[PDB]
Amino acid sequence: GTQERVNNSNKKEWNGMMGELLSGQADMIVAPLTINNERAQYIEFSKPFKY
Amino acid sequence: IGIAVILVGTSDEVAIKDAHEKDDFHHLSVVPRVELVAMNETDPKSIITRICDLMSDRKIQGVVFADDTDQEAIAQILDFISAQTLTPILGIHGGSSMIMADKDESSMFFQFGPSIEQQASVMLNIMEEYDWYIFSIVTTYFPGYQDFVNKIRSTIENSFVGWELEEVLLLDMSLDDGDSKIQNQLKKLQSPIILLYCTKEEATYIFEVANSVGLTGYGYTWIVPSLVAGDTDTVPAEFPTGLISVSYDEWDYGLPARVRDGIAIITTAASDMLSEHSFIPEPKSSCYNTHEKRIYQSNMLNRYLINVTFEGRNLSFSEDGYQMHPKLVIILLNKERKWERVGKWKDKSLQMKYYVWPRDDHLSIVTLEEAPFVIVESVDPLSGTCMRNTVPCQKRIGYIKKCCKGFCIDILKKISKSVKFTYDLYLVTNGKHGKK
Amino acid sequence: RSTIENSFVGWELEEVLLLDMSLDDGDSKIQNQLKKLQSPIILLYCTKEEATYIFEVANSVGLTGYGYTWIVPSLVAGDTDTVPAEFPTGLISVSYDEWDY
Amino acid sequence: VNIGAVLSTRKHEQMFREAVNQANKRHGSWKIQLNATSVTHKPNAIQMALSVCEDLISSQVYAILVSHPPTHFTPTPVSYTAGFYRIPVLGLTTRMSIYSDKSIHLSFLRTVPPYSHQSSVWFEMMRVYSWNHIILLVSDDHEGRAAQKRLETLLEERESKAEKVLQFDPGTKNVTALLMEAKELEARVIILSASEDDAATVYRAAAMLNMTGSGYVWLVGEREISGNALRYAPDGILGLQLINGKNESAHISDAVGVVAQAVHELLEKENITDPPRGCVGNTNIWKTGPLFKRVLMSSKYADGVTGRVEFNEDGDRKFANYSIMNLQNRKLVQVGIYNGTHVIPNDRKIIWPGGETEKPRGYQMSTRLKIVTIHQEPFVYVKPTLSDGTCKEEFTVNGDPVKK
Numbered sequence A: 001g002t003q004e005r006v007n008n009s010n011k012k013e014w015n016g017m018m019g020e021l022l023s024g025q026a027d028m029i030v031a032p033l034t035i036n037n038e039r040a041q042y043i044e045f046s047k048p049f050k051y
Numbered sequence B: 001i002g003i004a005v006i007l008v009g010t011s012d013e014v015a016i017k018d019a020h021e022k023d024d025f026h027h028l029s030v031v032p033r034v035e036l037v038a039m040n041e042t043d044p045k046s047i048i049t050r051i052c053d054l055m056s057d058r059k060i061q062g063v064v065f066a067d068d069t070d071q072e073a074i075a076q077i078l079d080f081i082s083a084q085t086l087t088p089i090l091g092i093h094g095g096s097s098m099i100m101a102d103k104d105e106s107s108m109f110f111q112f113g114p115s116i117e118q119q120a121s122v123m124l125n126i127m128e129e130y131d132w133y134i135f136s137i138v139t140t141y142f143p144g145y146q147d148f149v150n151k152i153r154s155t156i157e158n159s160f161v162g163w164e165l166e167e168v169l170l171l172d173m174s175l176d177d178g179d180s181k182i183q184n185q186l187k188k189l190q191s192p193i194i195l196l197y198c199t200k201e202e203a204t205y206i207f208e209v210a211n212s213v214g215l216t217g218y219g220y221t222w223i224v225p226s227l228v229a230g231d232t233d234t235v236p237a238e239f240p241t242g243l244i245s246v247s248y249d250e251w252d253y254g255l256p257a258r259v260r261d262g263i264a265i266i267t268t269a270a271s272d273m274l275s276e277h278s279f280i281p282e283p284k285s286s287c288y289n290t291h292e293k294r295i296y297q298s299n300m301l302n303r304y305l306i307n308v309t310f311e312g313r314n315l316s317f318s319e320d321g322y323q324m325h326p327k328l329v330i331i332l333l334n335k336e337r338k339w340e341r342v343g344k345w346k347d348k349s350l351q352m353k354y355y356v357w358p359r360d361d362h363l364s365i366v367t368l369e370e371a372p373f374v375i376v377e378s379v380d381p382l383s384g385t386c387m388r389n390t391v392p393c394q395k396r397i398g399y400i401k402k403c404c405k406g407f408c409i410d411i412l413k414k415i416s417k418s419v420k421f422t423y424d425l426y427l428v429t430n431g432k433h434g435k436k
Numbered sequence C: 001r002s003t004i005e006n007s008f009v010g011w012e013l014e015e016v017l018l019l020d021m022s023l024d025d026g027d028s029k030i031q032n033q034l035k036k037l038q039s040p041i042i043l044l045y046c047t048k049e050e051a052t053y054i055f056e057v058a059n060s061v062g063l064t065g066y067g068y069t070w071i072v073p074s075l076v077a078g079d080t081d082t083v084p085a086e087f088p089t090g091l092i093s094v095s096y097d098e099w100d101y
Numbered sequence D: 001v002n003i004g005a006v007l008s009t010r011k012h013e014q015m016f017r018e019a020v021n022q023a024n025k026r027h028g029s030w031k032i033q034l035n036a037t038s039v040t041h042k043p044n045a046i047q048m049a050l051s052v053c054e055d056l057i058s059s060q061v062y063a064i065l066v067s068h069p070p071t072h073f074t075p076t077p078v079s080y081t082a083g084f085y086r087i088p089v090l091g092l093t094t095r096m097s098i099y100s101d102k103s104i105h106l107s108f109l110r111t112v113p114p115y116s117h118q119s120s121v122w123f124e125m126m127r128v129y130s131w132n133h134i135i136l137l138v139s140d141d142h143e144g145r146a147a148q149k150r151l152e153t154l155l156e157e158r159e160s161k162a163e164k165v166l167q168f169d170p171g172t173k174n175v176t177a178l179l180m181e182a183k184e185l186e187a188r189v190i191i192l193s194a195s196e197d198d199a200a201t202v203y204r205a206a207a208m209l210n211m212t213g214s215g216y217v218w219l220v221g222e223r224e225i226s227g228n229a230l231r232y233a234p235d236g237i238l239g240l241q242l243i244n245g246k247n248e249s250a251h252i253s254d255a256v257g258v259v260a261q262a263v264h265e266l267l268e269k270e271n272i273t274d275p276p277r278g279c280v281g282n283t284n285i286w287k288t289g290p291l292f293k294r295v296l297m298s299s300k301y302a303d304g305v306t307g308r309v310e311f312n313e314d315g316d317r318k319f320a321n322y323s324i325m326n327l328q329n330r331k332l333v334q335v336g337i338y339n340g341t342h343v344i345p346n347d348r349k350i351i352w353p354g355g356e357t358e359k360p361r362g363y364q365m366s367t368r369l370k371i372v373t374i375h376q377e378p379f380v381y382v383k384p385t386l387s388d389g390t391c392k393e394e395f396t397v398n399g400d401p402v403k404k
C-alpha cells in the first residue's frame, strides 16, 4: 500500500491492503505491515507484535 | 422564435439592434425574431407588468434582461417570475448578473457569473503561481463562508504540493464590545496571505482593525473575492494598497457583446429541443391561469439550455445557474487606487503580467550554474514545483523558473535565515563570472 | 544596557522605544510606534497618568492580552489603594517595604 | 405609522386590528399612533405581489406581517417585493428554513423556528438515552441539507459524528435500495426528514423489509407524522410537535406587540426617513430598514401570549417549546416536553416498535470480520488446496497439527 496519483485530476488514493481497508472491503489487516507516520494518519495501528 | 431583449437605464439601443442582425443562423433552424425594448424605471411592479404584457401579446420563448444598477432584488424577482411562469430568463448585465445560490425549484433563470468555488480555485492558482504556500483564512458569519472553507480544504488536501493553512478565524461581527476579542485574535496571524471573506462594511471595519493591530504592512498580502471589492469605482480609504481580487470581465466584455452569445444559446437550445424531439412547444399566454397556462412540463428544454457549445467554450450552465466556463480577471490596488487589471484566467489557465510580483529587506541575487557550489539541473518534479532543498531561479531570456541547489545555495539560505532578509534568485545571461 | 552587556546570559534587547507625549495630536505616532513590539516581556517607565494613557492606547494593537507581561517601577504605580481601570491584570511592580516596616 | 398584514381570513384581520388597538392603548403615553391595514391572500403569486405593491407599499407601511394558509401560499412574493426597499417582513406560518438565508431573503423575521432547529431537539434525545450510533435519511432538497448540516455540526461539537448520511432524490418513491444498503450498517437508530409523500414511501419500504421490528428506533420531525404519512406511519415512532404553531391569533398578537415596542425605540433617534409612498418610479432603498431590523431583533419582549420573544443572529424564533409524542395503537400521545434546553418525560410509558417497554441499545456489533492478507513466505505460506475442498494436512517436526 502507498499513496499515488491518477491520470485524471489530482485525487489522493491508496492501493493494496491500505486501499482495501480504507474502502471498506476489509475490517482488519493481519500481515507484516510497518508502522509509519504516512499510514498512521488514516488508520490505527496496535502495539507492535514484532520489532 | 420570439426573444425579447429588455434594457433598463441608459444603453446604446442602436448598437444592440445592429449586432442582433449580425449572426449566421444558416447552420440552425430557429428564426430568432428579436424584439428590443428599453426603459428607465426598475420598480418590481413595472417589471412584472412589462413581462406580463409582452408575453401576452407576443410568442416569445426566451427573455434576456439587462440592467445598470446594483440591486440583487432585481435578480430575485426575475428568478421568481421565471419559476412562476416557467419561461427561461437570462441575466447578463447589472444587478440581474449577480450570482445568487439556492434558486427556486423548477426555475429557468440563468446568470452570467462565477460561483464562490471558482473564485477560491482562482485564488489558489494565483497563490501557487508565485510559490505562496503559507496562508490563513478569515471568514465572518455570512452566507457562503462554509462553502468557501470547504472548497479551500478540499483542494489543499487533494494535492501533491505542500500547503500550510495555519489557522481559520470566524470573527463574529455581532457581539457588543467584541472589538477586544477581534483585535486579540487578529494578532495571532502570521502568514503572508490571509484570504479574507466578508461583506464591504465588514471588510472595511476588519481592514481598519488590522491596520491598527499591525498587519497590512510590507510583508503581508490580502486576497479577497469579488464580493468584498464590490463597486470598483468606490474604493474605501480603509482598503490597504496591494489588495488582490478576482472579478468578472467588464472591460473587454461589452454590453453589445454580452447581449450576443446569449440569443445564440436560446436558439441552439430551442433547436435541440425541436430537432431531438421532433418538436419544441412554446405555449405561454400572458402571466396567469397557471393550471391553464403552464399545464405541460417544460423541463425538456432545461437539459438543452445547460449545454450550448456555440462559441463560449461549451458555454456550460450549471444546474445552480452559474456558468462553468466564465472569463475572470485579477485586479490589484495600485498607488492611485484605480483597481488596475493584472492577469486573466480561463479554462484553468493563468496569464499574469508580473513574473516577480513587484512590491526594505528585499534584494536581488545573481547566480550561475557551476560545480556543486551551485546546481541548476532540476526543472520540476511530478508535483510541478521545486523540491525541499531547492530554491526558485528565474532564467531570464523567456523567464522559465527552475530549481537551484548546492553549497552556495545552502550558504545563502542560512545567511538569509540568520540575517532575516528576503531575496529573489535569477541566473546571469551574458558572461560567466566577470571581466573588464 | 550596562547590566545586559556585562553578563554571560543572552537577552538580545529586542527593542527600545522613546514615546513623545508633549506634542498634541500625537496619538497616531504613539500607535504606530507601539506596533513594532513583539517581545513577551515589556518594561515601562513613565508617570501614572502617562501610564494610564499609554495603556488606553494599548489594548488596540493587542499588547495587553494573554502572552504579554508588563513590569513597572514604583513610580508608575503610586497610591496602591487607587488602581486605575486601564492597568492590565497581571502587571508586576517593585515597591518599598511599607507594610512590614 | 401604518402596519400592513396579509391574512387568509377576514376574522384574522379583525383580530389583528384588535391587537393593534390593544398595543395603542398599552403604548398610548407616547404621541405615536399605529394604523392597521389588512389584505387577503390570493391564489396567484403575481396577483399577490401586485396587491402588496399597490395597497400596501403605497401606505408607507413600516413592517408587513404574513401568514401562509395551509391551503402563492408561501410568503416568497411578499418577501421579494419588500426586499427591494428593505422593509422588514414578519412571517408566522412559515418554517421552510429557506427564509433563514440572509443573502436570499433580505430583512425577514419569523415568529416560529424552522424545521432545521428540530435537529437540536434530536441531540437532546441522543444525550438522555445513550444513542451514539445513528443514520440519517435526509432528502436532496435544501431543507434536508440544512438539517443534515445542523446535525453534523452538533455532533462535531460533541466530537462524535454519524456514520452514514445516505440521501434520496425527492419524488422517487423507490427507497428499497437505500434501505437495504443501510440495513447492514450495524446501526439501529434511524433519523428521517422528508415530505409527507416521501415519509409514506420510506415507511412502506421499511415495513416491506421488516425494518420496523424489534431493536429499531425511528425518529422523525413534524411533517412525517401528519397527513397521509401519519396513515402509513409504523407503530413506535417518536414524533415532535410545536406547542403553538397553528394558532395564528396568539402569534399575530405577539408580533403586533413586538413591532409596537420596537417602533417607539426606533423613533427615539434622528435621521429617520419615511418609507416610500408612491412605489411607481422610485428605485432607491428606503434607508429605514437598516437600524430597524437590528432594533427589532434586539427587542426582547417582556412577556407575550406564547412565551418569551427572542431572535437569533439569523432572525428566527428562539427558545421554543416542543411536545415529544409516541405513536401507540394508532393514537399519538405526548410523552415528553422540551422546554428549550432540556427534555423532561412525563409519567406515560413509551411503547417501542417491539413493545419491549425498555429502550433498545440501538447498536449491534458484528461478530464476523473480513481480513485481508498478503503473501509473505516467513509469515504467510499460501498453497493450492486439494481436489476435495481442503489442502493436505501437515505435521511439524514435533508432530503437531499445523493449522491452515
Ligand SMILES: *[C@@H]1O[C@H](CO)[C@@H](O)[C@H](O)[C@H]1NC(C)=O
Pocket: D339, D340, D341, D342
Ligand atoms: C428547562 O428545564 C431545565 C431542567 O432542569 C431547567 O434547568 C431550566 O431552567 C428550564 N428552563 C430553561 C429555559 O431551560
Ligand SMILES: [Mg+2]
Pocket: B101, B102
Ligand atoms: Mg448552496
Ligand SMILES: [Mg+2]
Pocket: B153, B154, B156, B157
Ligand atoms: Mg484538508
Ligand SMILES: [Mg+2]
Pocket: B254, B255
Ligand atoms: Mg457596460
Ligand SMILES: [Mg+2]
Pocket: B102, B320
Ligand atoms: Mg445547488
Ligand SMILES: [Mg+2]
Pocket: C098
Ligand atoms: Mg504608609
